[PDB]
Amino acid sequence: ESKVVVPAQGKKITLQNGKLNVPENPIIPYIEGDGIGVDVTPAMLKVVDAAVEKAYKGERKISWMEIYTGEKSTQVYGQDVWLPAETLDLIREYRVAIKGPLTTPVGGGIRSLNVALRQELDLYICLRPVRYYQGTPSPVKHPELTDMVIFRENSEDIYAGIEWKADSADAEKVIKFLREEMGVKKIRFPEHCGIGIKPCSEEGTKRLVRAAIEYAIANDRDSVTLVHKGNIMKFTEGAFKDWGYQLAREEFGGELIDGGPWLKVKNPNTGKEIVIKDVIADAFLQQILLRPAEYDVIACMNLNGDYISDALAAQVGGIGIAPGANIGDECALFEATHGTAPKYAGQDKVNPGSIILSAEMMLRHMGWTEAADLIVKGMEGAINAKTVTYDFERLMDGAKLLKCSEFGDAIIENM
Amino acid sequence: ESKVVVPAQGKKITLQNGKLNVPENPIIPYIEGDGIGVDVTPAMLKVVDAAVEKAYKGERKISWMEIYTGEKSTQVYGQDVWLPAETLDLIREYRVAIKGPLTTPVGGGIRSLNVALRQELDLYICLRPVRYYQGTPSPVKHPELTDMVIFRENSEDIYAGIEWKADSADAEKVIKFLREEMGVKKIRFPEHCGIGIKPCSEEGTKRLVRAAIEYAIANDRDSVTLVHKGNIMKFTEGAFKDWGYQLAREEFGGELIDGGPWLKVKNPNTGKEIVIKDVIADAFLQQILLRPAEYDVIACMNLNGDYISDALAAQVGGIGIAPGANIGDECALFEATHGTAPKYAGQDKVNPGSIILSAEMMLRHMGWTEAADLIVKGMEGAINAKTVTYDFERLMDGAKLLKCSEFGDAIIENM
């Protein structure tokens, strides 16, 4: 039967008119995760609870409910039950959830539980906030000028997996069609050629850009930059930038600046003029290094979103502590972007940064920005105090070595 | 008639058994270029001549022959003659050539002369050497650890231009075929969707990788890294990495290291063991920032090659002085990667770095590494001495402002 105990205290989050109605004692489902998830998750629960307790002084509390997926789901439900259907039901019903790293049933098992969750719950948006935390060792000279939020389209693009192996009957048939029926003259070597498809629709583009702007308004951000390689790939990447600008005008009353393509959207809550602009992907990669302060919310397609995220994390030295979320229309799933690392499982050694920052994304997503602000403040303070875990410690001279749990306490101490 | 005067002294470069037979007084065709090309080219000719004169002490000399393309071609041949056929003949016949920036006959003219040259001469390889020059203002902490050579496939990939506009009869027909005939279930929104094709052939991959390794052997480099996003795009990007590794084994006698995918190719001239390895594109972008010294020759597809090049130039602060070459089977065309900037045309103001470094690529391509070494040495010295042009000067405190021509002389002075 259901082995999930719904808390006695707590009320669930409602979705009405596109907005979330979050009660003072919301029930938030959580997946501990496999491997080191057993270490990082407990730290996360403690940090979030303190943030809430401190910011709202007892007037709010979260009723954590544990759901299952992965290795733990097996010891709770059966054997081959890696992703119990009721787990999906609970994430959709409760709207927001947070998960630790998951282990793929390697060999003859369900390929990556993460892709299963993302696809079944139609989590079309990959959100990757990237900012520098004072003290984190970085490779660039001025990482503190970086504070962006990447909105990566997660359901289309070349990542869609629509391809055919070179020399296969399929690949041959597709090439035949393209060259004969379509009159394609641009395929240099039609023999021993693999083919890939890159789709980009109006809806897929609009729904992502919409959220980007919504986010900027909701969080009082300065701008949304549509990143694309539209100069080359006109009908996909270029179409992306076109639909994006079109949406801002039509839905957000964007007004042209100097007649130029750039628009300005007035934030109806603060009066701030959010600038809607665009930069070519290859030029953007240079821009994030030369003029990071010029960018804020970034909206782009799958591939571009993936590359930019990894490149940014590296600049601010936050690869090991990169937060992330997969958001759809009915629910949002916050996660630890790192692996399971079964070697350190139970050792209370690993860095809880990723999942803790993912929790701040969750709190912010819930409107609880005060609490979210405390997590950022604590993180910065703890790292700046050089009271860090092994991974950071080994890269810092004069650092005090703390355990995963102790780092959690250090974050709480600097709130 | 032909308005190109073939020098009286000089002999042309021969191509035999894949190698070039370069005489001591080769005739090298050159395109001055439009706009500032009138400033930068003369500086280039002077720097190269000194490099040759100094390294070989009068035993070698280049017989520069001016050919035409662009604005200047008009005042020499007619009106609509932007790319005279005889110019193509001369580049192919003389094997190596160097050009300054070109101006596109905007409006109703031949779209980008550069793409015309590249496509007609089948210059399938875009070569972008990226290294730091002591003194150049950089955004990263340790740019001096960067010294890579990007081998970008230039004839295939998504850049091929094979796409159809959303909602057009064409786009609809292609989608119909894919979903009905191919059984494609992965196109989320088949309506109002633009489609792009990403082809990757064995030959296109092999010919590029071959050159990469040839280059590494010829220049005694340490490794060739096959960059790809093969984990996602298996039949194109993954196929690229597979064919690449296959070629190293078969043609270069690559031996497996620890049974791992990495191979080792022995340089038949130095005995050095050139490592053939691979990294995923998104991970590589992080690697160039965290461990730049681990990389050397890079071999990748069109898009990846474009992104990585721009990202690297930014790191070493060499965007304004980025050298580049388009190489094919019959000829190689070295060029200034910057624009025409008609505003500064004639003012002897702009930076001649790009084309000068492109010349060193040319000399190195000719086997004249001693002379090439002098151009690198001079450049470093001049920049390190802070005797630079306006663009660098404005970014350097205590810099001596030099004119385009004077910078040329400064390079010569530090050889």
Short mmCIF file of N, CA, C and O in Angstrom, two decimals, chain A residues 307-367:
data_model
loop_
_atom_site.label_atom_id
_atom_site.label_comp_id
_atom_site.label_asym_id
_atom_site.label_seq_id
_atom_site.Cartn_x
_atom_site.Cartn_y
_atom_site.Cartn_z
N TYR A 307 25.63 24.38 -22.17
CA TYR A 307 27.00 24.88 -22.28
C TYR A 307 27.28 26.08 -21.37
O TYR A 307 28.27 26.09 -20.64
N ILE A 308 26.39 27.07 -21.43
CA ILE A 308 26.51 28.29 -20.64
C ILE A 308 26.50 28.02 -19.14
O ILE A 308 27.27 28.61 -18.40
N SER A 309 25.65 27.09 -18.70
CA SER A 309 25.57 26.75 -17.29
C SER A 309 26.89 26.20 -16.77
O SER A 309 27.41 26.67 -15.76
N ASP A 310 27.45 25.23 -17.49
CA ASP A 310 28.72 24.62 -17.10
C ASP A 310 29.87 25.60 -17.15
O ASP A 310 30.75 25.58 -16.28
N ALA A 311 29.85 26.48 -18.14
CA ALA A 311 30.90 27.49 -18.29
C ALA A 311 30.84 28.49 -17.13
O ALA A 311 31.88 28.90 -16.62
N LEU A 312 29.64 28.88 -16.73
CA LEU A 312 29.47 29.83 -15.63
C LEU A 312 29.87 29.24 -14.28
O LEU A 312 30.60 29.87 -13.51
N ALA A 313 29.42 28.02 -14.01
CA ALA A 313 29.74 27.34 -12.76
C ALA A 313 31.26 27.31 -12.55
O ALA A 313 31.75 27.54 -11.45
N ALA A 314 31.99 27.06 -13.63
CA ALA A 314 33.45 27.00 -13.60
C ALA A 314 34.06 28.35 -13.23
O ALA A 314 35.01 28.40 -12.45
N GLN A 315 33.51 29.42 -13.78
CA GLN A 315 34.01 30.77 -13.52
C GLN A 315 33.92 31.19 -12.06
O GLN A 315 34.84 31.80 -11.53
N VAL A 316 32.78 30.90 -11.44
CA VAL A 316 32.56 31.26 -10.04
C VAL A 316 33.03 30.18 -9.07
O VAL A 316 32.87 30.31 -7.86
N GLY A 317 33.60 29.10 -9.61
CA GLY A 317 34.09 28.01 -8.79
C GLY A 317 32.98 27.24 -8.09
O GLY A 317 33.22 26.60 -7.07
N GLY A 318 31.79 27.23 -8.68
CA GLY A 318 30.67 26.54 -8.06
C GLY A 318 30.20 25.26 -8.70
O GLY A 318 29.05 24.88 -8.51
N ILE A 319 31.08 24.55 -9.40
CA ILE A 319 30.71 23.29 -10.05
C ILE A 319 30.23 22.23 -9.06
O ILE A 319 29.23 21.54 -9.29
N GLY A 320 30.94 22.10 -7.94
CA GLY A 320 30.57 21.14 -6.92
C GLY A 320 29.37 21.54 -6.08
O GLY A 320 28.80 20.71 -5.38
N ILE A 321 28.98 22.81 -6.16
CA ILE A 321 27.85 23.32 -5.39
C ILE A 321 26.82 24.02 -6.28
O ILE A 321 26.20 25.01 -5.89
N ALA A 322 26.60 23.47 -7.47
CA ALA A 322 25.66 24.03 -8.41
C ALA A 322 24.22 23.61 -8.12
O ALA A 322 23.94 22.42 -7.98
N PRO A 323 23.34 24.58 -7.87
CA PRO A 323 21.93 24.25 -7.58
C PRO A 323 21.21 24.08 -8.92
O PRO A 323 21.73 24.48 -9.96
N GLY A 324 20.02 23.50 -8.89
CA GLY A 324 19.28 23.31 -10.13
C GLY A 324 17.86 22.88 -9.89
O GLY A 324 17.54 22.33 -8.83
N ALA A 325 17.00 23.13 -10.87
CA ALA A 325 15.58 22.77 -10.78
C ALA A 325 14.99 22.47 -12.14
O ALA A 325 15.42 23.03 -13.15
N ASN A 326 14.02 21.57 -12.15
CA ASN A 326 13.31 21.19 -13.37
C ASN A 326 11.89 21.62 -13.07
O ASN A 326 11.27 21.13 -12.12
N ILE A 327 11.40 22.58 -13.84
CA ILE A 327 10.07 23.11 -13.61
C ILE A 327 9.12 22.91 -14.78
O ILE A 327 9.51 23.01 -15.95
N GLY A 328 7.89 22.55 -14.46
CA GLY A 328 6.88 22.33 -15.47
C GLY A 328 5.69 23.22 -15.16
O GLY A 328 5.81 24.18 -14.42
N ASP A 329 4.54 22.88 -15.73
CA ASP A 329 3.34 23.67 -15.48
C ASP A 329 2.65 23.29 -14.18
O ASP A 329 2.12 24.16 -13.49
N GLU A 330 2.67 22.01 -13.83
CA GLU A 330 2.01 21.53 -12.61
C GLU A 330 2.91 21.36 -11.38
O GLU A 330 2.41 21.38 -10.26
N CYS A 331 4.21 21.19 -11.57
CA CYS A 331 5.11 21.03 -10.42
C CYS A 331 6.57 21.39 -10.70
O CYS A 331 6.98 21.49 -11.86
N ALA A 332 7.33 21.63 -9.64
CA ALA A 332 8.74 21.99 -9.75
C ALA A 332 9.54 21.04 -8.88
O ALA A 332 9.17 20.80 -7.72
N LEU A 333 10.63 20.53 -9.42
CA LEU A 333 11.47 19.58 -8.70
C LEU A 333 12.89 20.12 -8.54
O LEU A 333 13.64 20.25 -9.52
N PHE A 334 13.25 20.46 -7.30
CA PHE A 334 14.57 21.00 -6.98
C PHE A 334 15.50 19.84 -6.67
O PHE A 334 15.11 18.89 -5.98
N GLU A 335 16.74 19.92 -7.12
CA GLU A 335 17.65 18.79 -6.96
C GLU A 335 19.11 19.12 -6.71
O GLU A 335 19.57 20.23 -6.97
N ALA A 336 19.84 18.11 -6.25
CA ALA A 336 21.28 18.23 -6.03
C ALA A 336 21.84 17.84 -7.40
O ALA A 336 21.55 16.75 -7.90
N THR A 337 22.61 18.73 -8.02
CA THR A 337 23.16 18.45 -9.35
C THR A 337 24.36 17.51 -9.40
O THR A 337 24.85 17.18 -10.49
N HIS A 338 24.85 17.06 -8.25
CA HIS A 338 26.00 16.17 -8.20
C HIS A 338 25.60 14.70 -8.23
O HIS A 338 24.41 14.37 -8.20
N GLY A 339 26.61 13.82 -8.20
CA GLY A 339 26.37 12.39 -8.23
C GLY A 339 26.14 11.76 -6.86
O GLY A 339 26.14 12.44 -5.83
N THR A 340 25.98 10.44 -6.85
CA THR A 340 25.75 9.66 -5.64
C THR A 340 26.98 9.38 -4.79
O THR A 340 26.87 9.25 -3.57
N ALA A 341 28.14 9.22 -5.43
CA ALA A 341 29.41 8.94 -4.75
C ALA A 341 29.27 7.95 -3.59
O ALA A 341 29.59 8.28 -2.44
N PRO A 342 28.89 6.69 -3.88
CA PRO A 342 28.70 5.65 -2.87
C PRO A 342 29.92 5.38 -1.99
O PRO A 342 29.81 4.78 -0.93
N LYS A 343 31.09 5.84 -2.44
CA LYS A 343 32.33 5.67 -1.69
C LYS A 343 32.30 6.48 -0.39
O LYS A 343 32.76 6.01 0.65
N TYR A 344 31.75 7.69 -0.46
CA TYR A 344 31.68 8.56 0.71
C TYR A 344 30.33 8.49 1.42
O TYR A 344 30.10 9.20 2.41
N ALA A 345 29.44 7.65 0.91
CA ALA A 345 28.11 7.48 1.49
C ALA A 345 28.21 7.13 2.97
O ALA A 345 28.92 6.19 3.35
N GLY A 346 27.53 7.90 3.80
CA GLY A 346 27.54 7.66 5.23
C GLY A 346 28.69 8.30 5.98
O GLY A 346 28.59 8.53 7.18
N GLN A 347 29.75 8.66 5.28
CA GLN A 347 30.91 9.27 5.92
C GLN A 347 30.76 10.70 6.42
O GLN A 347 31.63 11.20 7.13
N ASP A 348 29.65 11.35 6.06
CA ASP A 348 29.37 12.74 6.48
C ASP A 348 30.55 13.64 6.07
O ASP A 348 30.92 14.58 6.78
N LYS A 349 31.05 13.39 4.87
CA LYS A 349 32.19 14.09 4.30
C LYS A 349 31.90 15.11 3.20
O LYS A 349 32.43 16.22 3.21
N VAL A 350 31.09 14.70 2.23
CA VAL A 350 30.75 15.54 1.07
C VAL A 350 30.14 16.92 1.34
O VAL A 350 29.63 17.19 2.43
N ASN A 351 30.19 17.77 0.32
CA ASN A 351 29.67 19.14 0.39
C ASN A 351 28.16 19.19 0.18
O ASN A 351 27.64 18.73 -0.84
N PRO A 352 27.42 19.75 1.16
CA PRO A 352 25.96 19.85 1.06
C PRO A 352 25.50 21.11 0.32
O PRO A 352 24.30 21.35 0.20
N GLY A 353 26.45 21.86 -0.24
CA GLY A 353 26.16 23.09 -0.95
C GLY A 353 25.11 23.03 -2.03
O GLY A 353 24.17 23.81 -2.02
N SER A 354 25.29 22.13 -2.99
CA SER A 354 24.35 21.96 -4.10
C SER A 354 22.89 21.88 -3.64
O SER A 354 22.09 22.76 -3.97
N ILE A 355 22.56 20.88 -2.83
CA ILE A 355 21.18 20.70 -2.37
C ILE A 355 20.67 21.82 -1.45
O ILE A 355 19.48 22.14 -1.45
N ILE A 356 21.56 22.42 -0.67
CA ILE A 356 21.18 23.52 0.20
C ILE A 356 20.79 24.74 -0.64
O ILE A 356 19.77 25.37 -0.38
N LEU A 357 21.57 25.03 -1.68
CA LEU A 357 21.27 26.15 -2.57
C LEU A 357 20.04 25.82 -3.40
O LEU A 357 19.27 26.72 -3.77
N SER A 358 19.82 24.54 -3.68
CA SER A 358 18.64 24.14 -4.41
C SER A 358 17.41 24.38 -3.53
O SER A 358 16.33 24.72 -4.02
N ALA A 359 17.60 24.28 -2.22
CA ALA A 359 16.52 24.53 -1.28
C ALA A 359 16.19 26.02 -1.26
O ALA A 359 15.02 26.39 -1.15
N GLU A 360 17.20 26.87 -1.38
CA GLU A 360 16.96 28.31 -1.39
C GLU A 360 16.18 28.66 -2.66
O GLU A 360 15.32 29.54 -2.65
N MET A 361 16.45 27.93 -3.74
CA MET A 361 15.71 28.14 -4.98
C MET A 361 14.26 27.78 -4.71
O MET A 361 13.34 28.45 -5.18
N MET A 362 14.06 26.72 -3.94
CA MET A 362 12.72 26.26 -3.60
C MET A 362 11.98 27.26 -2.74
O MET A 362 10.83 27.60 -3.03
N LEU A 363 12.64 27.76 -1.70
CA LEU A 363 12.03 28.74 -0.81
C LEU A 363 11.66 30.01 -1.57
O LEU A 363 10.57 30.56 -1.38
N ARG A 364 12.55 30.43 -2.46
CA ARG A 364 12.32 31.62 -3.27
C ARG A 364 11.12 31.37 -4.19
O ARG A 364 10.27 32.25 -4.37
N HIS A 365 11.03 30.15 -4.71
CA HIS A 365 9.93 29.72 -5.58
C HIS A 365 8.61 29.71 -4.81
O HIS A 365 7.53 29.75 -5.40
N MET A 366 8.71 29.59 -3.49
CA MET A 366 7.56 29.57 -2.61
C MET A 366 7.20 30.97 -2.13
O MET A 366 6.21 31.15 -1.43
N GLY A 367 8.01 31.96 -2.49
CA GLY A 367 7.74 33.32 -2.06
C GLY A 367 8.49 33.66 -0.80
O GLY A 367 8.66 34.83 -0.48
#
